[PDB]
Design a protein around this ligand. Structure first.
Ligand SMILES: CCCCCCCCCCCCCCCCCC(=O)OC[C@H](COP(=O)([O-])OCC(O)COP(=O)([O-])OC[C@@H](COC(=O)CCCCCCCCCCCCCCCCC)OC(=O)CCCCCCCCCCCCCCCCC)OC(=O)CCCCCCCCCCCCCCCCC
Ligand SMILES: CCCCCCCCCCCCCCCCCC(=O)OC[C@H](COP(=O)([O-])OCC(O)COP(=O)([O-])OC[C@@H](COC(=O)CCCCCCCCCCCCCCCCC)OC(=O)CCCCCCCCCCCCCCCCC)OC(=O)CCCCCCCCCCCCCCCCC
Ligand SMILES: CCCCCCCCCCCCCCCCCC(=O)OC[C@H](COP(=O)([O-])OCC(O)COP(=O)([O-])OC[C@@H](COC(=O)CCCCCCCCCCCCCCCCC)OC(=O)CCCCCCCCCCCCCCCCC)OC(=O)CCCCCCCCCCCCCCCCC
Ligand SMILES: CCCCCCCCCCCCCCCCCC(=O)OC[C@H](COP(=O)([O-])OCC(O)COP(=O)([O-])OC[C@@H](COC(=O)CCCCCCCCCCCCCCCCC)OC(=O)CCCCCCCCCCCCCCCCC)OC(=O)CCCCCCCCCCCCCCCCC
Lengths: 37, 119, 50, 133, 61, 99, 68, 65, 119
């Protein structure tokens, strides 16, 4: 570009309109361990 | 950017990093600490960081910026507003360029294609 | 392993195979120890012979 | 000269304590046990003493949990369960009735094999009839 | 893998005289036959998990 | 994994002494000249540089300060504006950056 | 000092306290046997960068210089 | 170490696992003659820092001070 | 397979795993515990696991396998020999298909090519 080369593969603009449905996932701070006494 | 009033708390928690902060909803209890009279609509209290902003204006209108605004109910609103927009700007940027860091993203733990299993 | 197994992981195979022996006389000794503990509870607080 | 009569006196008391520890303790504490504290004080000695032994027993069980965790592939820096870092702690049931009514320790003898295991004996009753037994 | 297998909850008996609410309630409980459905994991008792609604009073340490 | 674990790329020799653990020697360690020798060696370089290496210096410093810029287009601007219309490749040879 | 920005992250000691930073106006002090709050009472989220060693930087300056 | 980004389970330096321990110096003369605690006041800035004052003496003469 | 008498210990230590075992050289001290007379050449004591094998033979010739071989100097040699070839067989396989696990391998922590640095 401005006297600098940034090598990158061929960009595929089709990746923009990619169907990505959001899936449920909950994190529980405070849960269960592997072993208990 | 959040295009709603509500956001899932887990969607802004880290999956492969310790969670030392949350992105909580606006603290409505701070609105009842203002001793003076004011008009506030419920349709503006859920959107992020705005309730703290309106409260700051109400406090800057009733009081000024010198020796009367310096009371605990009004300074906490100014601090919450200054702090809410800083965290939300950082979480928003981290969501834009580091979506794989958060829970709910499919890239946090990529699920392999069937061709990678060797069956 | 290829179809129905997991990753081949390296571990240290312990040849010593421990097993707690399930005995009868060990509980007899246990009762005797508690019998001494209970008798002391009686000897100190429930002894009226003096 | 020194007092030769006091030679090997610590050993001799140890052998009497081993021969009859309750009699050795009884007579060595007779003069002290003439002054008997109240039922409240005696109950506190017993309660706090046993409660201390109960926690020591839990600390031993947790040490075996860390050994199993070690063998399972997790190295352990430090020791104990008083996590200095960003973790949840559990201090142990406070030995007061309030918590002793809400909580009770996990009895291992209550963890059982599912009784559905006994339904595999149906195969035996059917085989015995097939073989003509 | 070892952690995942460890979360599959084990079976814990309902019979409990250590919690006084169950010591009273279980005296009026009716033991009904649990008809085998063909499995080996029928949760006819409570589960040994701290988050189970019938085991939350148990301390897992 | 052991907390006190280090990976070293050069040889080291450890002391086989009781109650102590340390590196007592480095294999094939050559002792260079003393501080007093390197001092005298440097004084000779600084002396000749003080007597015979001060003429035409103001121009070279401007070239060196120009070549410490981020972009080339600014270097050319620095040379044309500060170095009296100097050439990029002609100055790089003076400074020793050309092959 | 202002009340720290509400943070739901907490660490329990004796029993689950179910800390809710939105239930009270001012944050109560942390008791050893009750709760420990998250670090950074007054902290924000930023992005930082480690500074590469000086000798490694000089080799990069020499490569770019020898490149142009 | 916690602030540096390493979470800590447990506490102390009595490493239960596969780590070297460093017990406190035995309070007996044998170990008190071979070992001594690290005095922080002996960790210093390299005196080469004072050689930067040479620039000041040269600038003063350049400005005619 | 090792094609020499000597090997670098670090070459058989793990780089990304805890080191709980080493691959030590033959224990020449065990050779002096044999009470009987025997002939051993120094040219065979360094090769891995072979010393414990020759000692086992010497002990199985002087004594037999019943009530006389059962002495500590002879059983430790048989146990060492059996354990040495098992450990070396596993280490040799681990070196053949998992060379990236060990120190000294250029694949344990690969050094990137200059094309990956963006300069
Ligand atoms: C070349 C080849 C050969 C080379 C050989 C080289 C070695 C040479 C060997 C010879 C060494 C001895 C030299 C001659 C000594 C002459 C002095 C003398 O006249 O006697 C003084 C001494 C005087 O005693 P005393 O006057 O009758 O009454 C004592 C006081 O009244 C006190 O009575 P008390 O009731 O009040 O109790 C207090 C008692 C101490 O009482 C205690 O509380 C200590 C208890 C220790 C035992 C418990 C240890 C903990 C772990 C075990 C737990 C047990 C649990 C039991 C209960 C069940 C659990 C509840 O006090 C003492 O410690 C007395 C010790 C003697 C005083 C010296 C100063 C010692 C201070 C530092 C002591 C530190 C060590 C203590 C160990 C004591 C062992 C007896 O008598 C003896 O010591 C008799 C010794 C006879 C030994 C015969 C050995 C013959 C040679 C065979 C050796 C082969 C060894 C092979 C080794 C191979 C390499 C590993
Ligand atoms: C500061 C506290 C710190 C804590 C320290 C803890 C110290 C360790 C104690 C552990 C306790 C073990 C429990 C044992 C149960 C005994 C039950 C009983 O009724 O005992 C009577 C019993 C006497 O009744 P007896 O059977 O008819 O024997 C009389 C015959 O005339 C005997 O014939 P003799 O008179 O002609 O012989 C001479 C005489 C004097 O002899 C001696 O004293 C010298 C020998 C001492 C050797 C060192 C002993 C080391 C520890 C015991 C041995 C290892 C474990 C044995 C397991 C015992 C439990 C079955 O022998 C004896 O006194 C009795 C023999 C002593 C036992 C020796 C044989 C041991 C092996 C037996 C194996 C049988 C069980 C099969 C294995 C079971 C494994 C599953 O006493 C004993 O046999 C030994 C009891 C020793 C208890 C020491 C307790 C010290 C104080 C603890 C602290 C409490 C303070 C409370 C303060 C409260 C303030 C208000
Ligand atoms: C330990 C000190 C620091 C260490 C340095 C030690 C320096 C060397 C000295 C070592 C020896 C010290 C001796 C201490 C013991 C007392 C000495 C003594 O006898 O003096 C005469 C004394 C007579 O008492 P008195 O003061 O003349 O007047 C009594 C009148 O009745 C009524 O009198 P009053 O109306 O004026 O006052 C009422 C009551 C005063 O009220 C109280 O005493 C309060 C008691 C509340 C319960 C406290 C439980 C103790 C803690 C247990 C927890 C385990 C330890 C670790 C966990 C705690 C963490 C701090 O009187 C007393 O209880 C007298 C005892 C008070 C002073 C000693 C209390 C010690 C408490 C614990 C200190 C902290 C522990 C640190 C340990 C650290 C370990 C790493 O002897 C006694 O008979 C009383 C002793 C207490 C026992 C009561 C009865 C118990 C019955 C249980 C039977 C169970 C049978 C089991 C048999 C097992 C099978 C064989
Ligand atoms: C027709 C009339 C009714 C008939 C009555 C018949 C009574 C028959 C008496 C037979 C006596 C049995 C003889 C053998 C006794 C030996 C055992 C003994 O404990 O003697 C201690 C003996 C005598 O004690 P003391 O120093 O002379 O003091 C006695 C008095 O306190 C005096 O000293 P003080 O004046 O300084 O005391 C002032 C008092 C001041 O108290 C007050 O002013 C008010 C107290 C109100 C209490 C509020 C309760 C609130 C409860 C809340 C509950 C919340 C959680 C509940 C959760 C439930 C689940 C949902 O505060 C206290 O200290 C009370 C002492 C503790 C008493 C505990 C039991 C209280 C309930 C009584 C039940 C009977 C009620 C009869 C109705 C009477 C109506 C007028 O002292 C000793 O330490 C030696 C023995 C120690 C052994 C310790 C082992 C104890 C456990 C095993 C004992 C044996 C088996 C069990 C026996 C039952 C024991 C409770």
């Amino acid at each position: 570009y401005e006297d600098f080369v940034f090598t990158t593969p061929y960009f595929q603009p089709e990746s923009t309109f990619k169907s990505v449905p959001k899936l449920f996932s909950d994190i529980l701070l405070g849960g269960v361990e592997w072993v208990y006494t | 950017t959040i295009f709603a009033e509500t956001w899932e708390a887990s969607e802004y928690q880290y999956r492969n990093k310790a969670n030392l902060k949350t992105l909580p909803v606006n603290h409505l209890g701070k609105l009842a600490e203002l001793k003076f009279d004011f008009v506030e609509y419920k349709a503006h209290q859920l959107i992020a960081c705005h309730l703290y902003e309106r409260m700051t204006i109400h406090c800057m209108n009733q009081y000024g910026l010198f020796k009367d605004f310096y009371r605990p109910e009004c300074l906490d609103a100014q601090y919450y507003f200054k702090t809410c927009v800083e965290l939300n700007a950082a979480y928003g940027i981290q969501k834009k360029f580091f979506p794989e860091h958060f829970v709910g993203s499919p890239y946090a733990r990529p699920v392999p294609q069937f061709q990678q299993l060797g069956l | 392993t290829y179809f129905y197994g997991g990753i081949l992981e390296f571990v240290y195979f312990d040849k010593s195979n421990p097993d707690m022996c399930i005995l009868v006389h060990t509980l007899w000794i246990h009762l005797l120890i508690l019998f001494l503990i209970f008798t002391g509870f009686v000897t100190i607080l429930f002894s009226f012979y003096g | 000269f020194p007092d030769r009569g006091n030679k090997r006196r610590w050993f001799k008391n140890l052998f009497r304590l081993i021969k009859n520890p309750m009699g050795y303790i009884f007579w060595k504490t007779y003069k002290a046990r003439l002054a008997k504290p109240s039922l409240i004080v005696t109950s506190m000695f017993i309660g706090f003493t046993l409660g201390f032994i109960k926690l020591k027993a839990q600390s031993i069980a947790y040490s075996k949990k860390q050994y199993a965790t070690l063998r399972a592939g997790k190295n352990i820096e430090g020791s104990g369960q008083v996590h200095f870092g960003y973790h949840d702690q559990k201090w142990g049931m406070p030995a007061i009735p309030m918590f002793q009514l809400m909580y009770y320790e996990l009895p291992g003898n209550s963890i059982v094999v599912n009784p559905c295991r006994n339904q595999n004996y149906r195969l035996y009753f059917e085989m015995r009839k097939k073989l003509g037994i | 893998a070892t952690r995942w297998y460890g979360r599959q909850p084990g079976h814990l008996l309902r019979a409990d005289t250590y919690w006084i609410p169950n010591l009273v309630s279980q005296r009026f409980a009716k033991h009904q036959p649990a008809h085998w459905d063909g499995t080996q994991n029928m949760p006819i008792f409570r589960l040994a998990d701290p988050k189970h609604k019938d085991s939350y009073m148990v301390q897992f340490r | 994994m052991q907390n006190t674990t280090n990976i070293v790329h050069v040889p080291v020799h450890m002391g086989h002494t009781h109650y102590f653990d340390y590196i007592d020697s480095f294999p094939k360690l050559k002792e260079g000249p003393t501080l007093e020798e390197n001092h005298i060696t440097n004084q000779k370089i600084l002396r000749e540089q003080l007597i015979s290496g001060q003429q035409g210096l103001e121009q070279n410093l401007c070239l060196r300060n120009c070549f410490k810029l981020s972009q080339k287009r600014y270097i050319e601007f620095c040379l044309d504006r500060k170095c009296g219309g100097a050439d990029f490749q002609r100055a790089a040879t003076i400074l020793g950056y050309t092959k | 000092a202002p009340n720290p920005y509400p943070n739901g992250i907490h660490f329990d000691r004796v029993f689950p306290t179910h800390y809710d930073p939105l239930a009270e106006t001012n944050r109560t002090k942390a008791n050893l046997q009750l709760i420990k709050y998250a670090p950074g009472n007054y902290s924000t989220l930023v992005v930082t960068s480690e500074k590469l060693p000086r000798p490694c930087i000089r080799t990069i300056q020499n490569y770019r210089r020898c490149q142009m």
